[PDB]
Amino acid sequence: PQDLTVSLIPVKNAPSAKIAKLVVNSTTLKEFGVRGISNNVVDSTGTAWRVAGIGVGLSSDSLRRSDSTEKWNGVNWMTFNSNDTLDIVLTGPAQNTADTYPITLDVVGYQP
Amino acid sequence: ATKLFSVKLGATRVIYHAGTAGATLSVSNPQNYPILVQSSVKAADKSSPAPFLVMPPLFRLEANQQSQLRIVRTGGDMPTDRETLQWVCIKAVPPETLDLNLSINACDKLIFRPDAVKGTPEDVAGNLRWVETGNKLKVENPTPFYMNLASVTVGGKPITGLEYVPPFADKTLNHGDIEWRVITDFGGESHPFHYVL
C-alpha cells in the first residue's frame, strides 16, 4: 500500500515513561516527518511539547533514529525511516493528575 | 483506543503534459466518518509557490467517499527544454488516559513536461553516466527528465539514499557494475538498466 496509514497506539510517573507509539506505514514511502501539535510547543522541530489535561515528546532512542531535519514550507521537521515505530514519552525528570490528555501528531510523507 | 488514520491518492505521481487542459488525481477517505481535506501545490523545494491550482482546494469527504481533484497550470514561466517538478499535497484532518488524534499530509510529485520534451525518462535512462571514486558514487543525468531511481545496486549491493536526479543534473552519494530501474510515469518500475565499470 503506497498510501500513508498512521497509527497512534496508547501504551508520579517513571522517568521518560512511555505513553504512546507511532507507526507510519507505506510500501512506497522512504521517509516521513512528524511534529507534535500544541498550543505550547517547546522547540523548532515540534518533537517536545506541553499538553493540557504534562511535558511530552519523542524518546531519546526515537530521536536518535532521525535521518535529517528539513525545513519544509517554513517549518522544521525531523524525518524518519518509513514503517518505523517511534515512542512518545513524558519528557524530562519523573513528572507527577487524574485526567484525559490530548495528544496530536501531524505526519507528512513525500512519495518517491 | 488506538487512533488509525489514512488518506488514499489514486497515484504516486501526476505527469502534467504541457499541451493538456489539466490533470486529475483521485482522493478517497478510507475512514468510516467524514474528513476535511486541503490540497495545495508547492514548488520542487516543497516551500515556494508553484503556478498551479488544485480544484477544489478545500473540501469535505464523507465516510468512504472518493472524489477527483483537478490540477491546472495557471501561468508561470517554466522552462521549455526540461521538466519542472512540483509537489501536490493532500492534507487530511479528522474530527476531534490519552485522547489521541492525527492529521496527515500525503504529497506526490507533480511533474511538468514541456511539449518539446519528447518520450519518457525510461526511453533515455540508459544515458545516465556513473562515476565511482572511493566511497563516492555519482550519477550524471544529461537528459531533460527527472530520473526517479529505484532498485539501485552496485556490485549487487543495494544503494539506498540516492535522491531523485533532476534534469541536466548530478547526484553524489557516499564497487562494480551498477544496476537500476526508474519509476515510470505510471508508478511501476522499468526494466533494469546496467552500467559497467
Characterization of the model:
The complex is a heterodimer of chains A (112) and B (197). Chain A is built from one helix and ten strands. With 112 residues, chain A is mainly beta. Chain A has a single domain, classed as Immunoglobulin-like (Sandwich). The longest helix of chain A has 5 residues, at 60-64. The radius of gyration of chain A is 14 Å and the shape is globular. Chain B has two domains: 7-115, Sandwich (Immunoglobulin-like), CATH 2.60.40.10; 119-196, Sandwich (Immunoglobulin-like). Helices cover 2% and strands 51% of the residues of chain B. In chain B, strand 13 and strand 14 (157-158) form a beta hairpin. Classes of the chains: A mainly beta (112), B mainly beta (197). The A-B interface holds A 2-10, 19-20, 28, 30, 37, 70-74, 99-112 and B 1-9, 12-13, 30, 42, 46-47, 87, 89, 97-109, 148, 150, 160, 164, 183, 187. Strand 10 of chain A pairs parallel with strand 10 (98-113) of chain B. Chain B: This is Fimbriae assembly chaparone.
Please specify the SSE layout and strand pairing:
The complex is a heterodimer of chains A (112) and B (197).
Chain A: E1 5-10, E2 18-25, E3 31-37, E4 40-41, E5 48-50, E6 55-58, H1 60-64, E7 68-72, E8 75-81, E9 85-90, E10 101-110
Antiparallel strand pairs in A: 1-2, 2-9, 3-8, 3-10, 4-5, 5-6, 6-9, 7-8
Chain B: E1 3-6, E2 8-9, E3 13-17, E4 23-28, E5 35-43, E6 52-55, E7 58-61, E8 66-73, E9 84-93, E10 98-113, H1 121-124, E11 129-133, E12 136-141, E13 149-154, E14 157-158, E15 169-173, E16 178-182, E17 193-195
Parallel strand pairs in B: 3-10
Antiparallel strand pairs in B: 2-4, 4-8, 5-7, 5-9, 6-8, 9-10, 11-12, 12-15, 13-14, 13-16, 16-17
